Amino acid sequence: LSLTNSSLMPTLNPMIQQLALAIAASWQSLPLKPYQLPEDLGYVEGRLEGEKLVIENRCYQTPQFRKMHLELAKVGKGLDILHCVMFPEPLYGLPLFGCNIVAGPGGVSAAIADLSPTQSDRQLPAAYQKSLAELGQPEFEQQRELPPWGEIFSEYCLFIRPSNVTEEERFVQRVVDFLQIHCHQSIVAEPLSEAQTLEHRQGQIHYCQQQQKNDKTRRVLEKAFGEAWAERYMSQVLFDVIQ
Ligand SMILES: C=CC1=C(C)/C(=C/c2[nH]c(/C=C3N=C(/C=C4\NC(=O)C(C)=C4C=C)C(C)=C\3CCC(=O)O)c(CCC(=O)O)c2C)NC1=O
């Protein structure tokens, strides 16, 4: 979790570096245990006919979080990516924390973050709604509309092109705020009924199936590793459907 040994970190976009550090700091003092990705994946690289893609993976678990996945990637020299999801244990009914930053030579092109619902009514639990509303509406100059598969995201979802350093920092601070709310709610969550656990499991399955429709991720993976590898990676490593 200490990113001091990361090969990629020193070379990544500064907003990605700050967000990676914030996520790792959020996790550092939790009751962590390792989570073994398929084939005990850590670092991987690939190339076909174009640029090489390099990926670093860290993954943990706690009693409240089934799988806490932080991934850093770089395609060639330009394109830097941070991907993070905390997949909840359905027993506790917590939402899904996720974020993705994509950056190039010209700066950050996409910054997305959310606490995504798992309830059948598509709403965050009441305590989250309350705490999130109290943060206020953040202002960003260049909002982006989610694609249709993004119906999975809550009304608090951020999806922007940051306009300047102030907005980069405002976005990272809001992600820190989401993490602080999420970690707090994890300590007050009670184990739920079997019917409720089942409901939350279904919401998490749906979230993964929709995230797998994102061709932006798929094309990056395919250009470096090919179709079969990308399908395995998206369905088994990034967005595994629990069952
Ligand atoms: C191997 C990892 C990985 C790769 C290769 C990746 C690539 C990637 N994600 C993208 C968009 C995006 N990514 C997301 C969202 C997310 N994506 C996530 O994996 C998570 C957890 C969320 C949200 C919490 C959305 C909503 C878009 C825009 C999709 C589009 O414009 O159609 C883009 C386009 C950026 C842009 O338009 O400016 C790329 C290249 N994202 C990844 O995470």
Side-chain angles (χ1 to χ4, degrees), residues 1-136 138 140-243:
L1 246 200
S2 155
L3 306 170
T4 66
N5 293 339
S6 169
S7 59
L8 288 180
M9 269 289 283
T11 71
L12 297 168
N13 169 274
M15 186 188 176
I16 283 171
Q17 292 180 319
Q18 292 286 178
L19 184 54
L21 183 72
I23 294 164
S26 173
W27 295 356
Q28 67 190 336
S29 294
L30 296 179
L32 299 174
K33 289 296 184 177
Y35 178 104
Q36 272 190 224
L37 291 171
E39 302 181 342
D40 197 23
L41 183 66
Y43 177 99
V44 61
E45 145 204 321
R47 183 202 301 273
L48 284 169
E49 301 293 344
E51 302 292 327
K52 76 161 161 41
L53 168 59
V54 180
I55 309 175
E56 290 182 6
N57 288 295
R58 289 165 177 86
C59 207
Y60 313 88
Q61 53 184 310
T62 72
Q64 289 71 33
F65 303 118
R66 172 186 79 81
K67 175 178 169 175
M68 303 160 62
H69 185 204
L70 175 60
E71 177 167 281
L72 304 175
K74 186 191 281 291
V75 179
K77 295 170 195 305
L79 188 71
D80 293 347
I81 299 169
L82 182 147
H83 163 98
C84 179
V85 179
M86 301 169 67
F87 295 92
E89 283 293 356
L91 182 69
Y92 295 95
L94 302 175
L96 280 129
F97 170 81
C99 62
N100 177 202
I101 310 290
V102 181
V108 177
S109 65
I112 307 100
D114 193 37
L115 289 159
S116 305
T118 53
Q119 285 175 8
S120 69
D121 69 358
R122 302 176 66 247
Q123 307 300 305
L124 292 178
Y128 283 80
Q129 295 190 208
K130 186 158 185 167
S131 289
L132 286 165
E134 295 176 28
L135 295 176
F140 287 113
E141 288 178 342
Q142 300 187 72
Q143 303 282 357
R144 300 182 60 179
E145 181 78 4
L146 294 163
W149 64 260
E151 57 86 9
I152 64 181
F153 299 116
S154 82
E155 68 173 289
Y156 296 99
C157 190
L158 312 175
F159 180 18
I160 68 173
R161 173 196 196 255
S163 292
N164 51 44
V165 162
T166 299
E167 288 199 345
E168 292 181 11
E169 295 180 345
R170 177 179 303 146
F171 179 99
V172 169
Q173 178 65 237
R174 184 51 45 89
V175 179
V176 166
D177 297 336
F178 282 2
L179 287 166
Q180 286 180 176
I181 290 165
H182 196 41
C183 289
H184 181 73
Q185 295 299 134
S186 77
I187 63 180
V188 298
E190 37 215 326
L192 297 169
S193 81
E194 295 196 352
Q196 287 165 331
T197 299
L198 176 59
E199 175 183 348
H200 287 287
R201 187 173 291 272
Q202 302 164 348
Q204 174 169 169
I205 289 165
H206 178 72
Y207 177 92
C208 289
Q209 291 170 331
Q210 292 287 77
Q211 286 269 23
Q212 283 179 219
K213 296 181 177 176
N214 183 180
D215 289 344
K216 298 305 192 294
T217 293
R218 190 178 298 270
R219 185 179 189 261
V220 170
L221 304 179
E222 283 184 343
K223 286 302 173 189
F225 290 100
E227 289 86 345
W229 189 105
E231 166 60 23
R232 175 173 164 86
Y233 201 83
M234 293 182 73
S235 69
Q236 307 305 126
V237 178
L238 292 176
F239 298 110
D240 57 313
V241 163
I242 58 178
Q243 219 85 119

